[PDB]
Amino acid sequence: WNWSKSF
Amino acid sequence: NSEEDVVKMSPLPTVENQFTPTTAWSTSVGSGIGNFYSNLHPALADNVVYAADRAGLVKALNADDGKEIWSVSLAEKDGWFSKEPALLSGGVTVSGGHVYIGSEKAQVYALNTSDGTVAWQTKVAGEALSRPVVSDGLVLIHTSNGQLQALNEADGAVKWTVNLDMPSLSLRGESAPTTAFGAAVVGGDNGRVSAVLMEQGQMIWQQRISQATGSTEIDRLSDVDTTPVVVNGVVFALAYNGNLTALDLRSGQIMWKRELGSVNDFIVDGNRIYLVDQNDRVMALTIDGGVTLWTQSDLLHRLLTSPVLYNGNLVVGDSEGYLHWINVEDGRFVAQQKVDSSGFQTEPVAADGKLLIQAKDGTVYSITRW
Amino acid sequence: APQVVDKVAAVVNNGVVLESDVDGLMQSVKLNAAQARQQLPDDATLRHQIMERLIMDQIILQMGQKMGVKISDEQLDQAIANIAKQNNMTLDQMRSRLAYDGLNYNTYRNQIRKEMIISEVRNNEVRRRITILPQEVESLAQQVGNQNDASTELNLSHILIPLPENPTSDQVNEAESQARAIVDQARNGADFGKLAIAHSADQQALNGGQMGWGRIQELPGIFAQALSTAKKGDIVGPIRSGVGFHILKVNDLRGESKNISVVDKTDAAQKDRAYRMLMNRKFSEEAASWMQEQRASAYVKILSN
Amino acid sequence: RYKRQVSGDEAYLEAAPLAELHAPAGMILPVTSGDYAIPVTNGSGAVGKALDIRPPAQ
Amino acid sequence: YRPDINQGNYLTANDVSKIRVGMTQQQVAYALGTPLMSDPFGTNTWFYVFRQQPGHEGVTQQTLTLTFNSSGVLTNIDNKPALS
Amino acid sequence: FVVKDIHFEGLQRVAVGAALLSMPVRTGDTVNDEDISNTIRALFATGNFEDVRVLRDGDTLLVQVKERPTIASITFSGNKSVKDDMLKQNLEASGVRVGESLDRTTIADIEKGLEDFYYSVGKYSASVKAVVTPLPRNRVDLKLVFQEGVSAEIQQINIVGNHAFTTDELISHFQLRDEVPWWNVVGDRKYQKQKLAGDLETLRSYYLDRGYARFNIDSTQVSLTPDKKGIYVTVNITEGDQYKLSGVEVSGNLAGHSAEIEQLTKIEPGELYNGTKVTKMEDDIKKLLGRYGYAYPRVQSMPEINDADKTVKLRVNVDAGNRFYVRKIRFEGNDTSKDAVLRREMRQMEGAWLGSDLVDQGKERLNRLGFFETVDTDTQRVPGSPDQVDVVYKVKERNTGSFNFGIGYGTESGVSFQAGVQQDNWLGTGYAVGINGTKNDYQTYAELSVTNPYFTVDGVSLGGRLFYNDFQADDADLSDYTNKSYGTDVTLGFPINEYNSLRAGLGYVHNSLSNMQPQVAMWRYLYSMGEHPSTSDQDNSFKTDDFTFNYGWTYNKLDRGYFPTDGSRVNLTGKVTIPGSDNEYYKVTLDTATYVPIDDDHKWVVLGRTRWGYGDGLGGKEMPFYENFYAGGSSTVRGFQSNTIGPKAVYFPHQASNYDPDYDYECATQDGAKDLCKSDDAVGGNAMAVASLEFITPTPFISDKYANSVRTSFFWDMGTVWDTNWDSSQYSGYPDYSDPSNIRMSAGIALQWMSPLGPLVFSYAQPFKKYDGDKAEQFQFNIGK
Amino acid sequence: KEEVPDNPPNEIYATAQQKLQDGNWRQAITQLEALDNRYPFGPYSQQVQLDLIYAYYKNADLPLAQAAIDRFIRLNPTHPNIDYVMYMRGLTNMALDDRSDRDPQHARAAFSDFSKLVRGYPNSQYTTDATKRLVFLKDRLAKYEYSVAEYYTERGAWVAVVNRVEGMLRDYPDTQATRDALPLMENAYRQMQMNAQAEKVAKIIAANS
């Protein structure tokens, strides 16, 4: 699993 | 993440069983129709129960105990590894030692009762979901494409075809034509009842019985007919989200209407018309002027099945598999029973004093009361 | 103090109803009642009914504008012959209208315009809704050709208890109970005319429910069978149908053997008359369905001040 | 956000004055077309936060 | 390494032969097309430049300068098949 | 009634003068009930009037009105899957918004409009109810109650009439889907008209790519269940007999390019008609014409069909327009990114003949950059110009900063953690700055990276990197030794052919070593560097600093980045130390992977991989041991324990740091050790050669509908590692680790598919040829990041 | 959540004015919006709208400021204080513009607004600042054009450079951007061997600097 959260 | 429903499923009513129902026997056909919507249902004739499933398996069962007489599959296998389901979706029908079954691949199989061998196989315009009605040495099939075709019983060749306009959006299911005085009355998803001469299929007359349906496109405009019935020169049809109407058998004149719609089949008895509303509202309407005698909304939004009269008592199955006996004179419940957890989706069969019904899993049941 | 001159009585989907219209016809019916021998005591309930007529008139008149239906000035001059009964009273001038409106030419002419514009569109819409079967024409023609019987003529009064096209059980019972009570009241001594004013939903409610002289075969079989045995002054009903319950009182009965002969040619002589007879019932049955359909679909909001 | 919180409040900048371009003899500079012209306006108003930007009482 | 770079109008080496002396501005525009350059410094002169340079393959330039008169009439022609 | 004055009450938004103009009646004139009715009707038709009642005062004509109440606010409830702001946007587009009057007649209209929107977005049973709350000052508040119900999903996608191909295979390429296994990431189960049209086009292209020229779609049907929860899709087709391409003919204003064009249209007589090949030919013709100068070269192909011989004769119509030119290239919306970064991606240089292909390529490059959510193109005409146009690009800026976290598991790295913050556009300049950190069983890594993708507008990229690395050997089943290192690197990038890429750069690294178990191989290098550590104890230390010139070459040609079927990838990384550095060694690596399909559909592919590595010292020194190549694992040779292949350690007699009873030790002096010691622990080597031949076949048992998402491969992997500075003669007793003949081989099955929990790979191997000390591991898997 | 007590509009407006004097605009905006909603037709609705425009400008609510200005212009094109709203439009366009290489569309819009204001009402208090801001905006646009010209010069296109700097001369003949860009034209002409124009550019440069 790999999460990305654009900020 | 949560899921909600606009209409809350009605709770299971509590009813005291006036007479205790039983189960004479039950046999497992196979995988069954599953969650797919189809008209595939068992049929009864000469104390023989013929049934099938979506996979392509067909079985012949005894009508008193449930022993298997013969069985055969229709899923062609290209060796030992590959296998393609036949995708049967046409209700089992039997007439004159033949078994006609529809298919989702525009194929109609005619099997022999004695040994279950394929008498003949023919291709049609499209998916054959309608019940294979038989009359005057012909087999009528209503395909989803709107092409009404007639097939020879002995050979299976196409005799004639009629094209019916199809809307962009419709409901999954077509009408099974009914024959009267050498003429077939059929309906289409367009929202019109059509009558065609049996000999050639010439269009006799067409009538629209849909409601105003002036609302948003392909929404509130859905109107399927689902097997209209005719009695004493009077044609009875019921359209989903439409108005029930009575049509003259010769020209199609609207005698009277009533704002209500449903896709479930309705039965005609004496001077009472028992039908199930699209919202699972069991009611009885007077044959003459469509005057309601009683209503029973205790099973609202429970996904009921087409009713069948049995010993003067209506019988209906729900998605939960419960069977609800209701008095026809008043609509009051008389007996409730648990049959299967898979759920009931197809109409029951009532004939020769035998009550039969098939669940989603395909397990056929015989119902008796003691 | 300030005095109200006009108000809005009802709002239409694409129009409005003014309170001045109900007052104008309110006086007209009151004046007509005195000359017609029928007393008109009710005021509040009668006021309630007249606004319903305007509500139907406004919505029906509105459609005629949408579809492109108009009236000709020359037609009003012809209409004066019968609408104003100029033939009965030879006065086409406005002087005859001494009752009210100050002999204003435009107001009454516009009043005449409303009466016919609704009728024209109503007649056309209902007529195109009719369906005729050769089976019915032959059956009735032979029936009228069978000894040329059933020439009975009836003068009858009708009281209507409205019901929606999709009524619930409670509404059905309430209408049935009300209809039975009126029937019991009608025969116990209560005047039928007053009951029509109080409860009748028919267009004749202001007229006491009187339908005028007619022939028994005009009405459907549900009432014809009852009228066959009923005598003068009897109350027939209550009987349910799609629109609602009906209560009928036969005011008078007459008949004659004036058989029309050419030969009782049911193919030609009694076919057009039977078809005309069939059309008469067809108009009435589908005229009541059309009007109720207009009411339910029409948008309305009663206003009070 | 923050970049816009500096320009709006008080940030005022003054750029170099415009300089007319000379034309040597024997050639003519391209036409101007007056699309972006700064007409001379006489008057000594208030600038650089000396100008009250509060709306008038009307 | 770098992508192809194109500059100026396109000359087919044939339409150039179509233009004679004295032809009007409309005629030259119809024959070749509107130039991408001019001499804004007073004199009206049309400079047709055909410069192309594919990836690391040198540069080729064909220059065609047209000098007109006060009435938009062609009076001189200069063609440079390749740069010096 | 004569009127001498006019008065109104309730006039709020409509001006008195405007209303006076509206009413036909005017002061100083006779008025009747008819005129009053006309004025009331006009006022109501104005549209801002709710309750009209014209009133006569003692002398004045007074007017009273509530008026249509003004909409103060809009509230929403139940819109779980529908966002409030966009719902309000839809409402105001319909017309109803704040500040406007609320019509008391259209409530059903707005309800039905919202229900129509719900139907369009998918939900069919949605019910919308509006609640109106009157407020003083003729103000009104409306509240909408939403019962979203459920969204219907496709229950089946049936195709009728197909005989040449199975329906499952045909649906395999459809965007829409009917089965969504929990163990496969294939997509959702929703229905959309655009998706249906795309699926139809894909089916048509598939059929046309097999010689079925006469393929036709009779019609399609969409049906719903009575519950309005299931959706059925049916497609009727009529596949004709295959056809052959007899020949190709062209005609049109080719502009004297007929000779060149003919070479592009050449084909082999007696081939299968291929719409893709026809499209490629048309695109090639368009590209040639664009190279010639024309900007809009219309080209059409209308095949001529002869059913008698089942032959198709292509007829190509070519039309070349006029040579346009570009005057300006403008960008709008780049409020943050500067003009240069957008411009350098363009391929249609300003002031040159226009090209549609070049413009499209530039748009594609801008989209690839990723800084813009939406990119649009437009070609305006300059005023009064027949051949000059202006190219305008509209872009919408997209946020670039992105926090990132990652977790992965595997039999080699055990538990792995990935966490970093990345910024691709630093102040809208194109610089990419980001911090990443990696943690696993046997190493902790953290770096700061800054790079300029365009150091030179040609495409040269200048990098930069600062990294801190901690490595524990024991956790990596190697000889126990701890290496803590940190350094910085800078590199350049040279794109030369759009597939090759050269990169060179310098780097400084400082390495610290401690807690090392004595061993012959490692002490060889340590002695070569002049150190003389004690043998009895492992509390040794060693620090070094090195400057190295890094160079490498890359070659990428794979058709697809995921599950490639054809192409080739070659990588070569080489580093050497420059004078002044303590270490003096050079390391070279060569990775290679080749894919060769032997089937038209590319389902069957032969994959060959190789890996070469070498190194040694220069000034009579030895390559540092901590840079040795390792072999064995799920990446080099399956079936072997990770980093187990290669020479094994030789331990000297020494005392344990903290002896413990019933504790395993590598023959310490407290265990009767009086001589050299053999072991089974890998130490790596300075030379490595790994070759892997892999055979790919379709998954046999998984449903053909989605079987394309799982890759099944049979592999035969061989590898070997050895040391080139092992003095075999000096140590005769122990095995000669300098002989590369000890080749290791293995074979097994491998699986691979995309999973909701990241990539998954499984491999069962049975090493059949192994040497003494090699540790086998048949089962290997890796849930990577 | 910033609940606004429903006191008389006079009281609400007085409180909003006092809060505006304090400098906290987040409460003034709420007070003004509540006044507008509760009283869409007030005796001082125009003053409320102007105050709301001012609050939006000073609170970085630029899109709301633009919408309010557009609505005010549409409703009251002939209001006596039209110069104030035009000046506020110019200032909000400037703030939206907020790095010459960025998009100059906002700069062009501000230039147009300020030109309109100065040409319409040259005797208003907001004119000298308008002229100064117009000068700055012209310089900014010229700088952007010079930047793109320099980029193309480095790229190698010797036609786009000359065309763009010629446009710079045509549009902004009196800017340091053009003064520094003339050498780019000279270099381009020399590169393309157009000495006839290179000498002219050299003369133009020499005669100026």
Residue numbers in the entry:
A (entry chain G): 1 to 7
B (entry chain B): 24 to 393
C (entry chain F): 21 to 282, 386 to 428
D (entry chain C): 30 to 87
E (entry chain E): 28 to 111
F (entry chain A): 24 to 808
G (entry chain D): 24 to 121, 132 to 242
Provide text from the study.
After their arrival in the periplasmic space, the OMPs are taken up by periplasmic chaperones SurA and Skp (seventeen kilodalton protein) and subsequently transported across the periplasm to the OM. BAM is a multicomponent complex consisting of five different subunits, the integral membrane protein BamA and the lipoproteins BamB, BamC, BamD, and BamE, which are anchored to the inner leaflet of the OM. SurA bound to BAM can undergo a large swinging motion between two states.
To investigate how these SurA conformations are linked to conformational rearrangements of the BamA barrel, we prepared BAM and incubated it with a 1.5-fold molar excess of darobactin to force the complex into the outward-closed conformation. As expected, the BAM complex was in the outward-closed state. In the swing-in state, our refined map achieved a global resolution of 2.88 Å, allowing us to model BamA, BamB, BamD, and BamE, as well as the core domain of SurA. The conformational space explored by SurA and the interaction interfaces are fully maintained in both BAM states.
